[PDB]
Write a structure and sequence with these properties.
Organism (chain A): Homo sapiens (Human)
Family (chain A): Belongs to the archaeal Rpo3/eukaryotic RPB3 RNA polymerase subunit family.
Number of helices of chain B: 0
Subcellular location (chain A): Nucleus; Nucleus, Nucleolus; Cytoplasm, Cytosol
Strand content of chain A: under 5%
Distance between the termini of chain A: 51 Å
Structural class of chain A: mainly alpha
Protein name (chain A): DNA-directed RNA polymerases I and III subunit RPAC1
Helix content of chain B: under 10%
Number of strands of chain A: 0
Oligomer: part of a larger assembly
Protein name (chain B): DNA-directed RNA polymerase I subunit RPA34
Chain lengths: 49, 51
């Protein structure tokens, strides 16, 4: 694994010597399976906007 | 002493007022034709690959 850039909010490692199935598994995990926190419910007391 | 029919007229004149034609110049349009859409100069790529 070689790491070309790593600003904050960016990474560009290489990952030399792995198949397309494992690379695709890693890509699909980041997009759809790594957990995050986000607003689910909203209680609106007044809203004259 | 009355009015009597006189000799028949020998001719008729019909008058009308008419102006004339100018030269044919045929100036079709201020900015004429359909001017073509075209390239902005230089432009430059606005995108790069990663790595």
């Amino acid at each position: 694994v070689d790491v070309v850039h790593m600003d904050e909010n960016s990474l560009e490692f290489d990952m030399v010597g792995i198949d397309a199935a494992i690379a695709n598994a890693f890509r699909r995990i980041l997009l759809a399976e790594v957990p995050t926190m986000a607003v689910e419910k909203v209680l609106v007391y007044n809203n004259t906007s | 002493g009355g009015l009597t029919c006189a000799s028949a007229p020998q001719g008729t004149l019909r008058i009308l007022e008419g102006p004339q034609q100018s030269l044919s110049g045929s100036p079709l349009q201020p900015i004429p034709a359909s001017p073509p859409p075209q390239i902005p100069p230089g432009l430059r790529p606005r995108f790069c690959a990663f790595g």
